[PDB]
Design a protein around this ligand. Structure first.
Ligand SMILES: O=C(Cc1cccnc1)Nc1nnc(NC2CCN(c3nnc(NC(=O)Cc4cccnc4)s3)CC2)s1
Ligand SMILES: O=C(Cc1cccnc1)Nc1nnc(NC2CCN(c3nnc(NC(=O)Cc4cccnc4)s3)CC2)s1
Lengths: 403, 410, 409, 409
């Protein structure tokens, strides 16, 4: 036997040669993208062999074999339907319905401190299967969607028990919404501004703020498989002009000796405003999400980006603390680690399956995207993705993991 | 072909006979117990044909075919290692090390506020495992009865959601943890108790089961309900604890009257009776083994693993596991949800009902409590368990560093 | 000279005899009432001498002299305009305007939660004054009995401190206002109720009076105590209010059970009994006149102004006036202390027991409550009173702008 | 007759002439000081005619007459024992033992969080009295300058209310104590600070004084005001403390930013500048003698007792006394209001601005603080003071048990 050859006969049909368009539509139908970085060597060798001629072009058994031999292990598993969602092409048609029925919820206010009709969802599974619907490629800032990401970096570089010398691990209480510190004089959790600010003070001490920002950008690039990550100076300067609450928080933390020694608080706050003005798209962000869904390995490159300890802690606190005052209601009904931001984003993680990012700017009165919240409810109302759904007895729900 | 076609010829060895002890030690090493109710028909025909014929006593394939034919589906996936934990004999050897490593934790105080919990020796300590396929294991003081106390709150919440639905129940009780000092308030800001796992919410949930009927039938209804969760293993009642809970309970009488004034019960409720039904549900008796099957029922989407019976709706089980995650270990719940990530529920007798979804249910029991109300040995065992297996709610099933995955063997 | 004789010459005009009607209207304009108890030796001797003959009936200087001689000390100060309010008849006419300007305040709802407080007309309204010298005045429905309800908490707290002292009593109850919503917590952080003016603290204070003795004698002792505080004017009891309060009081039962687990009572307490005693104490009946004398007793350092009897220790009167200042009007207590500055205590029947220390006691009553539980017309009257006289606790007695000062001439 | 002979009566003793020391010792024994500003015309003419005449030197009846003629009203009231405390020499001797008995109280920590406060020996301790008539007395370290710190909060609140009225000021600041674990919240539920005596509320009051003007005139305007409140005795400024407060004040910067975010200031407020104006007002310096005259102005309905000038409106003085009563001693306010019953305000330098309305103002000072921030010797002196005289806000002015009443003999 030869595993490059018998994949050739899976796609060949019995016909003696394989056209290359038939290979790319068979591939794009697994849900992989032909621009997948784990597919570079194979797609290099196929642009190479269509300069060779231009009369077709079908591939022999040795030509297909020498196009795919260095990527066949990932390609067989794709074609023997061994990915986390085997029937990926049906699943996106459900994503499309969930997207389109959430598209009809017009209500909400867009943050004013900017079209209210943008709405996009993007999926990245832990195997790299991708799909998008709507305005999936318009940049927007993470705002508070960065709080799990910089927390993950902090825990990765420093460990849990150092990070949680400075910030708690529990939800406030649905009217300790207003206190900055718990009773041990630590912020409640990394997902509120006070805790996020302290987490930002922990990343890359000893070096100046420009290199700190670069290190987080490098880190976010690995999480997104080197897809789109940018920076909006406009939101930066407007958050730097409007942040009297974050300035109040910084002065309270300084006096209560809540930062690591040698901290410049007023600078840390400017670093904090930079990190909330970082730009993503729904597609780039969904890869970040899928990195957390995949135990710390980026799904479209295979690179270990975050330690399992960071990814677990981050998923744990997005569960309890991730959707502002709606976190309890959200944890009960949806049961997924999620994190919302005031541009309208919701970074969503279905552990061991997929990462998601949906984005629509109109917010509900608790600060969460209306359409995003609607989509998340519908998704778990249709598939056994809820954290405490049973994988064997699940009533009317769908399990996209099965055939 | 068929399937006995090859289950017998699987372990037969090639030899045309299986001695019956070699079949039962092969069975008991899967971790099933020969008294498993789904093995009733098969074990009867082996007791019988060890009377029909007693000179062997080996089994032909045509004799083995009539012992296992009505239990064959469970016996092949039992023997083709398709149970959730395939190498069960290694797993229990880990359970044993974690049991013996928590056994050295001296600390804690036994609950004394009633004389009937101060009679349980502080040196008792038992853990029991019931996986979702019926595999069992026990170590320590595992057949000793003790009262559920607040381990019963998730069980009765699940009963209420099953019979009444999520939206009726939660007109009367919330779905979030207090806040680590709204732990003292009886009501959240919508004038509902915070969640079913605290005393005020448990009392209100008790108010919802089996309305219109008197307390004797209400209790019977919950007891048949708990009997099915436990696969008809031991469920009892300690009248000694009930009478002593009934007059040391001024806290719950304070709660009951506040809830009446704030009109938190359903119409037509006799609150002082509800308080007596509530004191009874907290005196229900289990052992670690019985309770571990109850837990495994929540681990199995609502089906009891040792009978195959549907006991709770998936919506009830999911709601109950959701609220045990956030609110199940008193003030320690946030830390527990972070570090352990398993749905668990603590009681003042020393129990910790533990559920690892899709894998197993557990009950650990040691009476000494830490200052927050949780069994010290349980808390340590739970911490040690998750530090050794990728059972945490947000461990990854593919990349888990040095941890073990007993759902795998390679 | 002589003290009975010069006064005859103050009242005589120069005339050789005094008609006895001219003497009693001269006396009633002092503001004293002819039924004043410190005045009965004198009013006995005038009923005696209008049997003599009924053909006159004027008094010589020796006939007037031994009618008034055993009450002469009180009548000279009365007629030498030495009472705390010398021009009492202008003051009542000001009190009359305050009564009539509050009569136009319609709002409020009458309590329903007992069919005994919802039977009361929404238009009854009375104010009564008893000064620390005994001068009396009333306007409106001042002789209609109604229940003290929570106006009794300062009274029983005073009894408690009188019998046991401040340091014993405040082992069980605090001395401060909670905070404008720690109003919903039962206990402060030392596991004592916040202060005797909230139900939790009132319940605990009820547990301190007359321990060891059964509830029937405990109730008798408090009634004797209230009898002295009111100069033996009207004190009654509504069993209708009692039984309806005792079947509707689920919050008060919640409170007692909570205080019991938290070991808040003195040892040997039967908690469920104490709640029944607490419900009895809130069904005690007064009128605006009877209650105003109780108030005037607190205004007068513990002496009842119409009998001269020491009723409460000065230590009890100060503590009770302090906590009525801080804690006496439910959620309005801060606003009330700021604007009115008078120790007051409101109850759900519509009463406001009000004290102007060193001057007068008052009780006003109108059943409609505002959204915080206080009588609308009572609250309005109290505001106007201090907006017109320098009675506010931190008004200056020398520089007070346009306010009136009824203690001066 | 007229007042100058009848003064010449009493002072003569029978002699036909008065030695001038004998008049001055009789004058100093009323407790007036010969430097009292209302007495300067009399004292100039006595210094003058002790140049004119070196002949004795006693004063004839016309020599006494034209020295006291322009101050004769204040000297007869002084010499007819008509001042609020007539036996001033017995009273100060009581003040002396109260001071000496608090001198034995070892405890407390000197505020050290700024080096300008560690430099104050923990053994300085002074109390000063200014009665509402100008009578003065001091014991201990009463001429040592120290900063008002938070004793300035009632003073600037009084300035704001005098210029702006109660209803404008309290659009931005409440009227109640927080609650004794709302020690940490900045705003009550209407998004106003709880009251002017906490840091957030004081900061907001600083927003209201002299808006539209820059900080230099704003400060000058407040300094005029304090000068007149102290009858032009010592009011200074510690620039050393100001720089250390603007350097350590992240909690006030935390507070300023929170108040900015919730629009608690008036439109057009520069908040970080208001924080600098607030740090200046806390470094204003007094001594115990200077400050005690400030206190007496609040004791006197807005008139400074040693100059006769109207400085604050009666409404300002009442509001400020009300809130010092409830909120002026940090977390100890409820205990203090209960046990002491006097308007007081403490500061972290160790001062306690104290007011006994209608009688006297005081400032006590010893730098060691107890764990709640109040001067240990001050709190003790206050307890002893009210445990000795019927000055408590709700003591009775007629029935006060064994306590002393310095307004009587
Ligand atoms: O603990 C201590 C001492 C302390 C003090 C300070 C800090 N630490 C400790 N004080 C206590 N006194 N009483 C207690 N038990 C009471 C049960 C009866 N009450 C309620 N229970 N639940 C209630 N719900 C609501 O208020 C609803 C609501 C409405 C609006 C907003 N939020 C919530 S009111 C009061 C609590 S605790
Ligand atoms: O909300 C409003 C208005 C309101 C009032 C009432 C009801 N609803 C709304 N008031 C507010 N005032 N200030 C606010 N902002 C922060 C809270 C005060 N500070 C703190 N931050 N964290 C803190 N915690 C600790 O004390 C730790 C601790 C110790 C003990 C117990 N528990 C906790 S204190 C900084 C400013 S909000």
């Amino acid at each position: 036997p030869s595993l490059e050859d018998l994949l050739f006969y899976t796609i060949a049909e019995g016909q003696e040669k394989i056209p290359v368009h038939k290979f790319i539509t068979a591939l794009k139908s697994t849900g992989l993208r032909t621009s997948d970085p784990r597919l570079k060597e194979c797609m290099d060798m196929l642009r190479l062999t269509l300069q060779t001629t231009s009369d077709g072009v079908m591939l022999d058994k040795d030509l297909f074999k020498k196009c795919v031999q260095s990527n066949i292990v990932l390609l067989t598993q794709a074609f023997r339907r061994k990915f986390v969602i085997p029937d990926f092409m049906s699943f996106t048609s459900h994503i499309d319905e969930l997207y389109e029925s959430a598209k009809k919820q017009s209500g909400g206010k867009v943050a004013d401190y900017f079209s209210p009709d943008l709405w996009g969802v993007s999926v990245c599974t832990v195997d790299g299967q991708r799909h998008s619907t709507g305005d999936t490629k318009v940049p927007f800032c993470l705002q508070s969607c960065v709080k799990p990401l910089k927390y993950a970096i902090a825990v990765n570089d420093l460990g849990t028990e150092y990070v949680h010398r400075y910030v708690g691990k529990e939800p406030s209480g649905l009217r300790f919404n207003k206190l900055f510190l718990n009773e041990d004089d630590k912020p409640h959790n990394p997902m509120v501004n006070a805790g996020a600010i302290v987490v930002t003070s922990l990343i890359k001490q000893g070096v100046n703020n420009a290199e700190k920002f670069d290190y987080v950008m490098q880190f976010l690039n690995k999480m997104a498989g080197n897809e789109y990550v940018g920076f909006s100076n406009a939101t930066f300067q407007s958050e730097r002009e409007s942040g009297d609450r974050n300035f109040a928080i910084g002065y309270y933390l300084k006096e209560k000796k809540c930062f690591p020694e040698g901290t410049d608080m007023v600078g840390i706050l400017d670093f904090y405003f930079q990190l909330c003005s970082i730009e993503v798209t729904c597609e780039s962000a969904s890869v970040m999400a899928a990195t957390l869904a995949n135990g710390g390995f980026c799904p479209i490159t295979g690179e270990r980006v975050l330690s399992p300890e960071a990814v677990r802690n981050t998923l744990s606190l997005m569960h309890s603390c991730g959707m502002y005052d709606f976190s309890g209601q959200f944890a009960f009904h949806v049961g997924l680690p999620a994190k919302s931001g005031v541009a309208g984003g919701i970074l969503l993680v279905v552990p061991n399956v997929m990462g998601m990012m949906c984005w629509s700017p109109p917010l509900d009165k608790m600060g969460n995207s209306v359409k995003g919240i609607h989509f998340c409810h519908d998704l778990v109302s249709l598939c056994n993705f809820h954290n405490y759904d049973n994988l064997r007895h699940f009533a009317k729900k769908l399990d996209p993991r099965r055939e």
